[PDB]
């Protein structure tokens, strides 16, 4: 079960200054980047072309090159329509892709945010504003929906190209997608926000894939004070997580941190404080 997402970030500061940059993810691994400064889309894996021929990839890339220029022009024009109703700076984000369900299934999506808020999606055969989107967007969306060529291309991309491309990525990227990297753990302590206490920290770094279990223990007893942080990325396509425990002075003795992970083969790491 993998989410494939193409993430477009477009910034318009004035009529003269704008940039569009994109990144593409297959699950939590980056497969592409396309900087504003680059004419072509960059591969960030050896397998980023999936199973498409150079012909098919080039046709896709050319379509996206035309899109990037056209989108920029359209936005700066489709500003003036409902402007100075609205005006600069303008931030647009687009998230498009597909989720590859069990067996044969997949569902595609194309969502757009304006000034950090979801306003528009493509759905079935047309663009639509979401309930509560600013009413001024209705006219620009009507203008976009009159362009049947764009509609047909987006329909193709969502219905056909996305799942097609992703099947090929999954096959081509198998050894990376299924990689197992082992966590290494360590213990430290930092100041607590509560008086009379210290915060014990169990650090877990370098593991892949994400799913992991980390708990402070006193023997077989799980310490329910265990506060798991967020998954934080390392720069080498592995993960970091810490689990903290606020403990009373002289209650530290007997505590351990226990880590379970798919890569360890049932052989948990246990560190004692």
């Amino acid at each position: 079960n993998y989410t494939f997402r193409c993430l477009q970030m477009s910034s318009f500061a004035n009529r003269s200054w704008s940039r569009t940059d994109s990144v593409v993810w297959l699950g939590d691994l980056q497969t592409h980047r396309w900087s504003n400064d680059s004419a072509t889309i960059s591969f960030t894996k050896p397998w980023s072309q999936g199973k498409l021929s150079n012909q098919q990839w080039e046709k896709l890339q050319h379509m996206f090159q035309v899109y990037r220029v056209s989108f920029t022009r359209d936005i700066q024009e489709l500003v003036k329509m409902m402007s100075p109703k609205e005006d600069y700076p303008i931030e647009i984000q687009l998230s498009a892709g597909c989720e590859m369900y069990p067996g044969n299934a997949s569902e595609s999506f194309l969502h757009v945010a304006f000034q950090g808020k979801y306003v528009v999606r493509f759905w079935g055969t047309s663009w639509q504003t979401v309930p509560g989107a600013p009413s001024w967007l209705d006219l620009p969306i009507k203008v976009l929906n009159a362009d049947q060529g764009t509609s047909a291309t987006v329909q193709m991309l969502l219905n056909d190209t996305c799942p097609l491309f992703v099947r090929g990525l999954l096959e081509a990227g198998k050894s990376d997608l299924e990689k197992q990297e082992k966590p290494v753990a360590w213990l430290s302590s930092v100041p607590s926000s509560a008086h009379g206490h210290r915060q014990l920290v169990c650090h877990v770094s370098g593991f892949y894939p994400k799913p992991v279990w980390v708990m402070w223990m006193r023997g077989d007893q799980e310490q329910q004070g265990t506060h798991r942080g967020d998954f934080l990325p390392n720069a080498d396509e592995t993960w970091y997580l810490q689990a903290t425990l606020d403990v009373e002075a002289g209650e530290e003795a007997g505590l351990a941190c226990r880590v379970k992970h798919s890569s360890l083969g049932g052989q948990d790491i246990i560190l004692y404080w």
Binding site: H203, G206, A235
Partner: protein, 96 residues
Amino acid sequence: QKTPQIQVYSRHPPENGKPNILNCYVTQFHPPHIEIQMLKNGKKIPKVEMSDMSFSKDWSFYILAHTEFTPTETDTYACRVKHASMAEPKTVYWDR
């Protein structure tokens, strides 16, 4: 407009005199224009590597900065962020 959150952490267990990587992960900000500096003893570290900016399902942006370092007993490290949402730069120190 959304304020950046900043987390600072090492790639490997810190051992004095052993090469390591220090990470500064900056999240939850909007708009995406931002300046990120990593500091050693209050001075800017030159060769800091930046990931490509990206964003979450909730549309908030994130980016990872990192740098090679060899910790010592007395070197202090931090990550300092400038963003339009904050009048002042925000600094978080590595906890070591």
